Amino acid sequence: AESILEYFRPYLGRIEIMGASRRIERIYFEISETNRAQWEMPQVKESK
Amino acid sequence: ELRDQQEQVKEDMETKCFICGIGSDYFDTTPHGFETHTLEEHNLANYM
Amino acid sequence: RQFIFDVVNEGGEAEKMELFVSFCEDTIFEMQIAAQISERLRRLTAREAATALAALLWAVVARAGFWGELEVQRVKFLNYLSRNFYTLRFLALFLAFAINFILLFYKVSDSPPNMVYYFLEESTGYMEPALWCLSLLHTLVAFLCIIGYNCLKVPLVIFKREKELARKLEFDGLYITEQPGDDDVKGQWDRLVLNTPSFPSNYWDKFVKRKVLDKHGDIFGRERIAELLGMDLASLEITAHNERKPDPPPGLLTWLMSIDVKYQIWKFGVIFTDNSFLYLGWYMVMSLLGHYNNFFFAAHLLDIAMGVKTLRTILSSVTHNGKQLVMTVGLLAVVVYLYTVVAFNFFRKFYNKSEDEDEPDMKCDDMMTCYLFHMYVGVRAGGGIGDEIEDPAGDEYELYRVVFDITFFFFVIVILLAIIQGLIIDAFGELRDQQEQVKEDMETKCFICGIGSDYFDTTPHGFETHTLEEHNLANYMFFLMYLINKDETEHTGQESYVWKMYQERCWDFFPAGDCFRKQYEDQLS
Amino acid sequence: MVMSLLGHYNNFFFAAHLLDIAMGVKTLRTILSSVTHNGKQLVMTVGLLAVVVYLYTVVAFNFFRKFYNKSEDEDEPDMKCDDMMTCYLFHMYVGVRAGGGIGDEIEDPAGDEYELYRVVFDITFFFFVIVILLAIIQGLIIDAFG
Amino acid sequence: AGGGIGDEIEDPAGDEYELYRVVFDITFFFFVIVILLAIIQGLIIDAFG
Ligand SMILES: [Ca+2]
Incomplete structure (x- = not known):
């Protein structure tokens, strides 16, 4: 399943939180296409 | 004085995760370790 | 030593190891050209x-300062010309003093022995013809340097460019997948050299063309690749060296016109774009124009005093902040102009030169003169x-002059000119900080391991041995050279394992x- | 001994004694070491001044000879631009x-003949061998204390 | 001054002891003006740091 993974690699998010069990957990979620586009703008990136 | 501040922001982000409290010394036992920890794991961009 | 300072000054991710391996094969080719x-x-x-002061200055500088026969001789001489060198350049500097010291005795009079630039000599009868003999001698040693340079340092930069191009075709699809950047000259000029049959001249292997044909040629037009990359008649190439090994007839000194025209044009593009070569090229025209x-000849000692080390260290300070320093002068020009208009409307009756019986000169009517007077x-x-x-003793507009002059003195004299003096003062502190940083980093880290000197000191005299007996970033160069000089069939299990990943440019075998x-x-401490 | 005996x-x-004995007290050596700390680089920079001022001498020798006079009355028996010696010595001293x-x-330079070439010639001289070159020398001893 | x-x-235009004035004046200007007075300016500059 390497070919399917590579197409969805830029879109698969991943974070880490800790709560409700006093232990660390992983989270997975979908990143929308447009939100990946307008995030990488010269104005927005410089403000960061 | 101003030049000293410019390097200080550079150094602090280099050896700390800005989310974790862990220095780069601990995240280097695994080869090429600290670099992945700031991109694959929590990277203060996925959270947004 | 230069390599270590560069890498650790701007250090990041695994790019460091890639540079180190790149350096190891850079100096290997250097050995090949040294032994020949x-x-x-x-x-x-x-x-x-x-004479006394010039001897003092020179002492200060010097304390830190038959076709067969044809072929054979020519070869040998280019050979040791090159060999020698770093000497010649030293000789050129010395002749710059002598040719300038003699020039220091001219005389101007309106009577031939149109102004007459007759050169008067001193009490001794010499020093007139010495100018002539040294003038011819200086050009010879000058022109001799270019020949030496064109056979000692030039083959390295060609090797550096060819090596970096081969990687970007095989392990990258730069020229083959989509395109180069189409903005840099270097990324566009090199496009010309692809078609010529002799592309990998100074680089080691000449099979780079074949390698990329099968890797990226599967999903691309094999005919299309077989013309962009040169390599015409792909069938002929695969069916040429498969029957025997013929010996081509010799065509020496007869068909020299039949050569790779394309390769020479591309190669000469690299020569004229190198900064080091151009400096020597400009050195020729001034000497010849002398x-x-x-x-x-007076323009030579200026640009050659940089040869000795101490000048470059000090002179780098002003060039370190070049963009900011030249900028500040601009801010002075606009401010002084802003002070010009205010005088143009109120204080016109002050800018005179107190000429007697009349004032035919006025420095306030023209905006040109009023502005030029303030700047100059x-x-x-x-x-x-x-x-x-x-x-301004006259009470008419008396006090407005006092406020006008004082603010001018505080702003464009005390403050503005102190910024300029402050930039070069700050430059020395910045450069000195970098010098200690390279010293400190290598002291407490292995440069291969990630371990500090605190852990390698539990055993007495521990850290010192770890950087000499164990991995010492000098054995690795010997090891990589050892692999090349050994047959493939004789490799042991561990040597062959390393040699395989070296082909794929994977750097996972370093400890890190x-x-x-x-x-x-x-187990055993 | 020889200076005292020669006294x-x-x-x-005897006036040469207090100069070389003021170093006996501690505070002089601390301050005086700053100039001697960068001795090789400091004496070097003066040399770079000498070659530059010379490079400014030749350019005046070929174009601006009719300016270096002392405005003597009824005649100008003194010229500071004919000899390369005097032209160079005048610039240094x-x-x-x-x-x-x-x-x-x-x-x-009010005369329009070669009027503007004097302005560019003088200004670049003032920025280079006064504002910049002499600030390096002042900057070396300042850096020494740090 | x-x-x-x-x-x-x-x-010192007079040739009698002409050059000894030049060396005498120049060394005076480098030592007690350019260098000595820069030390004094350098001390208070170093104080702020
Ligand atoms: Ca075997």
Whole structure:
């Protein structure tokens, strides 16, 4: 399943939180296409 | 004085995760370790 | 030593190891080119003081300063010309003093022995013809340097460019997948050299063309690749060296016209774009133009005093902040202009030169003269324009002059010129900080391991041995050279394992975190 | 010993003693070490000044000869531009201490003949061998204390 | 004087002891003006740091 993974690699998010069990957990979620586009703008990136 | 501040922001982000409290010394036992920890794991961009 | 300072000054991710391996094969080719060339009180008249002081200056500088026959001889001589070198360049500097010292005695009079630039000699009858002989000698040693340079340092830069192009075709699809950047000259000029049959000249292997044909040619037009990359008649190439090994007939010294025209044009593009070569090229024209019987030799000692080390260290300080330093001068020009308009409307009756019986000269009517007067005088006055005006003792607009002059003196003299002095002062502190940083980093880290000197000191005298007996970033160069000089069939199990990944440019076999001692703490300490 | 003994020659040779003995007290050596700490680089920079001022001498020798006079009355028996000696010596002995470059020790360039070439010639002289070059020398001892 | 004592003397244009004045004035200007007074300015500059 390497070919399917590579197409969805830029879109698969991943974070880490800790709560409700006093232990660390992983989270997975979908990143929308447009939100990946307008995030990488010269104005927005410089403000960061 | 101003030049000293410019390097200080550079150094602090280099050896700390800005989310974790862990220095780069601990995240280097695994080869090429600290670099992945700031991109694959929590990277203060996925959270947004 | 230069390599270490560069890498650690801007260090990041695994790019460091890639650079280190790149350096190891850079110096290997350097060895190849090195082995192919080996085989009351008395009166003090000026001249006396001039000689004494010039000897002092030179001492200070010097304390830190038959076709067959044809072929054979020519070869040998280019050979040791190159060999020698770093000497010649030293000789050129010395002749710059002598040719300038003699020039220091000219005389001008309106009577031939149109002004007459007749050269008067000193008491001795010499020093007239010495100017002629040294002038011819200087050009010879000057032109000799270019020949030496064109056979000692030039093959390295060609090798550097060819090596970096081969990687970007095989392990990258730069020219083959989509396109180069289409903005840099280097990324566009190199497009010309692809088609020529002799593309991998100085690089080791000539099979780079074949390698990329099968890797990226599967999903691309094999015919299309077989013309962009040259390599015409792909069937002929695969069916040429498969029957025997013929011996081509010799065509020496007869068909020299039949050569790769394309390759030479591309190669000469690299030569003229190298900064180091151009400096020597410009050195030739000035020396040759010095035969025009002029002072053009005086431009040589200026650009050659940088040869000795201490000048470059000090002179780098002003060039370190070049963008910011030239900028500040601009801010001065706009401000002084802003002070010009205010004088143009109120203080016109002050800018006179106190000429008698009339004032035919006015420095306030023209905006040109009013502005030029402020720039050419108002800055160097040392105290502002208050010393080059009519006295404001007259009560008419008396106090407005006082406020006008004082603010001018605080702003464009005390403050603005202190910024310029402050930039070069700050430059020395910045450069000195970098010098200690390279020293400190290598002291407490292995540069291969990630371990500090705190852990390698539990055993007495421990860290010192770890950087010499164990991995010492010098054995690795020997090891990589050892692999090349051994047959493939004789490789041991561990040597062959390393040699395989070296082809794929994977750098996972360097330790980077554990070095033979954390592995065996509990077992045998 | 020799200076003290040579002082019996009935002269001022005793005046050379307090100079070399003021270093005995501690505070002098601390301050005086700063100039000697960068000795090789400091003496070097003066040399770079000498070659540059010379490079400014030749350019005046070919174009601006009719300016370096002392405005003597009824004749000008003194010329500071004919000899390369005098032209160079005049720049070294005066052009550096002038505080504002050689622009204050020349004929006025108000004459339109080669008028603007004087302005560019004087200004670049003032920025290079006064504002910048002499600030390096002041900057070395300042850096020494740090 | 801002430039040493060279501005408050008789002109040394006379060849008698001509060059000894030049060496005498220049070393005075480098030592007690450019260098010595820069130390004093350098101390208070170093104080703020
Ligand atoms: Ca075997």
